[PDB]
Design a protein around this ligand. Structure first.
Ligand SMILES: CCCCCCCCCCCCCCCCCC(=O)OC[C@H](CO[C@@H]1O[C@H](CO[C@H]2O[C@H](CO)[C@H](O)[C@H](O)[C@H]2O)[C@H](O)[C@H](O)[C@H]1O)OC(=O)CCCCCCCCCCCCCCCCC
Ligand SMILES: CCCCCCCCCCCCCCCCCC(=O)OC[C@H](CO[C@@H]1O[C@H](CO[C@H]2O[C@H](CO)[C@H](O)[C@H](O)[C@H]2O)[C@H](O)[C@H](O)[C@H]1O)OC(=O)CCCCCCCCCCCCCCCCC
Ligand code: BCL
Ligand code: BCL
Ligand SMILES: CC(=O)O[C@H]1CC(C)(C)C(=C=C/C(C)=C/C=C/C=C/C=C(C)/C=C2C=C(/C=C/[C@@]34O[C@]3(C)C[C@@H](O)CC4(C)C)C(=O)O/2)[C@](C)(O)C1
Ligand SMILES: CC(=O)O[C@H]1CC(C)(C)C(=C=C/C(C)=C/C=C/C=C/C=C(C)/C=C2C=C(/C=C/[C@@]34O[C@]3(C)C[C@@H](O)CC4(C)C)C(=O)O/2)[C@](C)(O)C1
Ligand SMILES: CC(=O)O[C@H]1CC(C)(C)C(=C=C/C(C)=C/C=C/C=C/C=C(C)/C=C2C=C(/C=C/[C@@]34O[C@]3(C)C[C@@H](O)CC4(C)C)C(=O)O/2)[C@](C)(O)C1
Ligand SMILES: CC(=O)O[C@H]1CC(C)(C)C(=C=C/C(C)=C/C=C/C=C/C=C(C)/C=C2C=C(/C=C/[C@@]34O[C@]3(C)C[C@@H](O)CC4(C)C)C(=O)O/2)[C@](C)(O)C1
Ligand SMILES: CC(=O)O[C@H]1CC(C)(C)C(=C=C/C(C)=C/C=C/C=C/C=C(C)/C=C2C=C(/C=C/[C@@]34O[C@]3(C)C[C@@H](O)CC4(C)C)C(=O)O/2)[C@](C)(O)C1
Ligand SMILES: CC(=O)O[C@H]1CC(C)(C)C(=C=C/C(C)=C/C=C/C=C/C=C(C)/C=C2C=C(/C=C/[C@@]34O[C@]3(C)C[C@@H](O)CC4(C)C)C(=O)O/2)[C@](C)(O)C1
Ligand SMILES: CC(=O)O[C@H]1CC(C)(C)C(=C=C/C(C)=C/C=C/C=C/C=C(C)/C=C2C=C(/C=C/[C@@]34O[C@]3(C)C[C@@H](O)CC4(C)C)C(=O)O/2)[C@](C)(O)C1
Ligand SMILES: CC(=O)O[C@H]1CC(C)(C)C(=C=C/C(C)=C/C=C/C=C/C=C(C)/C=C2C=C(/C=C/[C@@]34O[C@]3(C)C[C@@H](O)CC4(C)C)C(=O)O/2)[C@](C)(O)C1
Ligand SMILES: [Cl-]
Ligand SMILES: [Cl-]
Ligand SMILES: [Cl-]
Ligand SMILES: [Cl-]
Ligand SMILES: [K+]
Ligand SMILES: [K+]
Ligand code: NA
Ligand code: NA
Lengths: 151, 151
């Protein structure tokens, strides 16, 4: 047990209503988030490869194992994993994020934001309950504070 | 140095003409290979997650580092990496493949083949020189024989 684990459980309370509302079987997630810009997208992938090469190998392994288990408990019409496995996933990703320097995480965020059309967040939000999306994001802000303290 | 490394250099001789011919900046690679079938595709991704969780963490790390270096040497109008970095990539992936049981690798191959439309290989081949694609594949057959012997 650790503090990211505890923080993940508060994140779930804040965000699992939102996770149940997203239709995870929508084909839209395979689409570029706006115009496909292969050269800019390669830049964003390079930043993620750098981050992955720097991330703790055991925490990467655990994150994969948590997603395999989360695939096993998908149910309902939107393909949502169980609440326990949602929390498991979020804690294991928080530990990966904490295992690399802050600059590597911001470089993925900035490099992806460059290729994301400004309409994409509001479009996604419009498909779920907006209050539950707000509550999920406020959850995320509290969670990343604990992550940063282990980082 | 190892035998997969040596085998990668013979693979490059056989396959780098083909790699120069693929237009790696084509947007088509983001598309599903045929009809998007989210539930079947999740099955194929689950098999890759299982394989990744079982793969040697150091060899996964080295494979990411080799792709970061290969992104650095992209040139020309098709986005092809250098010949040296092509070989580097192929040897590092061969080592990952050798670090897990044969069944995990076949389960990814079978689970992806299930979602790949039968026209997709011939369509891809039609965009390059067909003899060089054949030579690249015969390379791959010789390479996977060395991989299997380290596996
Ligand atoms: C096949 C090859 C591989 C293909 C895939 C690889 C590439 C993947 C690219 C596609 C994924 C991108 C689309 C994701 C959209 C979700 C992000 C979002 O909705 O974000 C919404 C926000 C909204 O903006 C925020 O809005 C906030 C509003 O808060 C206010 O209001 C709030 C509640 O409303 C709270 O009350 C809060 O306290 C109050 O401050 C603040 O103003 C913030 O400053 C502002 O940042 O937009 C932002 O962050 C701006 C940037 C948006 C995009 C940034 C990306 C975010 C995630 C990047 C990391 C990885 C993603 C890919 C990796 C794949 C995984 C392995
Ligand atoms: C954003 C979320 C993430 C998105 C992406 C995740 C999912 C990705 C799915 C999209 C990628 C799939 C499309 C790839 C097509 C390339 C495969 C191919 O052209 O293959 C062509 C072959 C042609 O068939 C072969 O044809 C051969 C012909 O050989 C003959 O002829 C030859 C030369 O012509 C030689 O002479 C030889 O000696 C002689 O035997 C033999 O008959 C073989 O038995 C037969 O298998 O089709 C086959 O294998 C049949 C199966 C074809 C598809 C199988 C997949 C292959 C690769 C799977 C592994 C990973 C891919 C995804 C992972 C992502 C990476 C991290
Ligand atoms: C071995 C490594 C792991 C893995 C490592 C990572 C890492 C590392 C990250 C992702 C993130 C994401 N992964 Mg993952 N991921 C894996 C397996 C999967 C599988 C699968 C089939 O198993 C799927 C479908 C996905 C899907 C996703 C997306 C939901 C998301 C990227 C788009 C995004 O930002 O949407 C928006 C994201 C969500 C809807 C997820 C929940 C986010 C928070 C907790 C709550 C909602 C807040 C707010 C409303 C919306 C997001 C705004 C912010 C700017 C964060 N991953 C593998 C097994 N994944 C990224 C992410 O979520 O970025 C924010 C991320 O940082
Ligand atoms: C950390 C892990 C690694 C990684 C791990 C893997 C693993 C593991 C595999 C892939 C494979 C692939 N990866 Mg990779 N990959 C990474 C980074 C990338 C990046 C990036 C921007 O850095 C890109 C663009 C890609 C692109 C690709 C595709 C070319 C390919 C999956 C589709 C396919 O089978 O096409 C067909 C493939 C090619 C055109 C590549 C060369 C194949 C051989 C050597 C020569 C051509 C033979 C023949 C003509 C065509 C293929 C037929 C066969 C059935 C093999 N990877 C990261 C950093 N990648 C898979 C693959 O190639 O399956 C065959 C695979 O097994
Ligand atoms: C081989 C292998 O290992 O694969 C694994 C590798 C990983 C990395 C581990 C992995 C993973 C995680 C991944 C890739 C997550 C990807 C997330 C992508 C989210 C995409 C989104 C949000 C896309 C869009 C596109 C939109 C377009 C919207 C618009 O066009 C619309 C409609 C109408 C227009 O008029 C206006 C518009 C509004 C502009 C939108 O609104 O959103 C996974 C899945 O495990 C597979
Ligand atoms: C060895 C091996 O296998 O490697 C493989 C390993 C993987 C894992 C499979 C792999 C991969 C994927 C990777 C690394 C994905 C990385 C994802 C990073 C996500 C980062 C996020 C969300 C960052 C942020 C930053 C934010 C900042 C928000 C704020 O600052 C803002 C705007 C304004 C402020 O006022 C307040 C604020 C709120 C502070 C935010 O909101 O979000 C890869 C590439 O395949 C390699
Ligand atoms: C088709 C289908 O059915 O797919 C099914 C597939 C599954 C797997 C079963 C499934 C599922 C679950 C999924 C996808 C869950 C996704 C979770 C994503 C979690 C992402 C996390 C936590 C990311 C971050 C990024 C962080 C960044 C933090 C910082 O940068 C920030 C901000 C500010 C800096 O100053 C300091 C900092 C600390 C650096 C962080 O702290 O955290 C589902 C729903 O069932 C769908
Ligand atoms: C070859 C093949 O087929 O592979 C298949 C493999 C799979 C794995 C089966 C597959 C898949 C599934 C995938 C990747 C799923 C990824 C899902 C990502 C979902 C992202 C969502 C919901 C994003 C948002 C963003 C939002 C933003 C809301 C806000 O910012 C807004 C507006 C303003 C403020 O209020 C703050 C805010 C509240 C922050 C929101 O509210 O939500 C797929 C696609 O089938 C392809
Ligand atoms: C977040 C993160 O970590 O992301 C990283 C995660 C990874 C896993 C490390 C990673 C990687 C590797 C990946 C995903 C490789 C994906 C390869 C996909 C190849 C896709 C192909 C071939 C798609 C198609 C679609 C076709 C459609 C063809 C047709 O429709 C056409 C035209 C005409 C129709 O009439 C008939 C038809 C012929 C049927 C086709 O012929 O081919 C990467 C890139 O590093 C990003
Ligand atoms: C901890 C962590 O970060 O995990 C992350 C790590 C990654 C790496 C980023 C990640 C990932 C991606 C993974 C595992 C991708 C796996 C790719 C596997 C590819 C397999 C291939 C090509 C297999 C084959 C089998 C073949 C068989 C061909 C033949 O039998 C046939 C037909 C007929 C015979 O007569 C002759 C024959 C020729 C013998 C072939 O031709 O090809 C993931 C999921 O994101 C998790
Ligand atoms: C947008 C853009 O510019 O992107 C740029 C991005 C880059 C990275 C810079 C770039 C590049 C390089 C790239 C993608 C290279 C891809 C290489 C893929 C290599 C895949 C390999 C070796 C896969 C396998 C699978 C194997 C399976 C073997 C077996 O199953 C088989 C068969 C039979 C079983 O009985 C025994 C077995 C042993 C289990 C194996 O042996 O090997 C490029 C070209 O510049 C494009
Ligand atoms: C959000 C966003 O934008 O992300 C972006 C991120 C990136 C990384 C920038 C990006 C990218 C690039 C990607 C994934 C590239 C993947 C390339 C895969 C290429 C696959 C090819 C060539 C496959 C084939 C298969 C062939 C088969 C030939 C044969 O079987 C045939 C017929 C018959 C026999 O003769 C045997 C044979 C000879 C075996 C062939 O000949 O070739 C993209 C797409 O821009 C999206
Ligand atoms: Cl506890
Ligand atoms: Cl571009
Ligand atoms: Cl040598
Ligand atoms: Cl389906
Ligand atoms: K479970
Ligand atoms: K180089
Ligand atoms: Na460790
Ligand atoms: Na090792």
């Amino acid at each position: 047990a650790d503090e990211i684990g505890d923080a993940a459980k508060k994140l779930g309370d804040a965000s699992y209503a939102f996770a149940k509302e997203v239709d995870w079987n929508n084909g839209i997630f395979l689409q570029a988030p706006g115009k496909l810009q292969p050269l800019e997208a390669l830049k964003a992938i390079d930043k993620m490869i750098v981050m992955g090469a720097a991330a703790d190998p055991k925490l990467l392994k655990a994150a994969a194992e948590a997603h395999h288990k989360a695939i096993g408990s998908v149910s309902g019409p939107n393909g949502v994993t169980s609440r326990a496995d949602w929390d498991s996933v979020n804690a294991a990703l928080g530990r990966v994020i904490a295992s690399v320097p802050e600059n590597m995480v911001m470089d993925v965020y900035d490099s992806v934001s460059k290729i994301t059309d400004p309409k994409v967040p509001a479009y996604m939000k419009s498909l779920v309950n907006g209050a539950d999306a707000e509550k999920a994001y406020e959850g995320f802000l509290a969670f990343k504070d604990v992550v940063k303290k282990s980082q």
